[PDB]
Structures are given as structure tokens and as C-alpha cells.
Design a protein around this ligand. Structure first.
Ligand SMILES: [Cu+]
Ligand SMILES: [Cu+]
Ligand SMILES: [Cu+]
Ligand SMILES: [Cu+]
Ligand SMILES: [Cu+]
Ligand SMILES: [Cu+]
Ligand SMILES: [Cu+]
Length: 40
């Protein structure tokens, strides 16, 4: 909850909401735009 990694996500909810680019809860398999369990 208070730790993340690096959301270089270019998804549709990552490219718009950059408020999670420092705490996105996704594994190293978030390369698709329909498998992103991020903040949104
Ligand atoms: Cu991310
Ligand atoms: Cu994403
Ligand atoms: Cu993110
Ligand atoms: Cu994420
Ligand atoms: Cu992603
Ligand atoms: Cu994600
Ligand atoms: Cu993300």
C-alpha cells in the first residue's frame, strides 16, 4: 500500500492517471492494456 516500483505503464489508465506512477500495484507482466490491476 505504501510501496510500489516503476509504473512505466502506457496503458489507458496509466497514461492518464500518472498519480500512480510511483506506487502502481502491478507485477512485471503489465504489458497489456487489459490486464493492469493498477489503482484504476
Ligand atoms: Cu504502473
Ligand atoms: Cu497500466
Ligand atoms: Cu500507474
Ligand atoms: Cu500499476
Ligand atoms: Cu500496465
Ligand atoms: Cu498495471
Ligand atoms: Cu499502472
Amino acid at each position: 500500500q505504501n510501496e510500489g516500483h516503476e509504473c512505466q505503464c502506457q496503458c489507458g489508465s496509466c497514461k492518464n492517471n500518472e498519480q500512480c506512477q510511483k506506487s502502481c500495484s502491478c507485477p512485471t507482466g503489465c504489458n497489456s492494456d487489459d490486464k493492469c490491476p493498477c489503482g484504476n
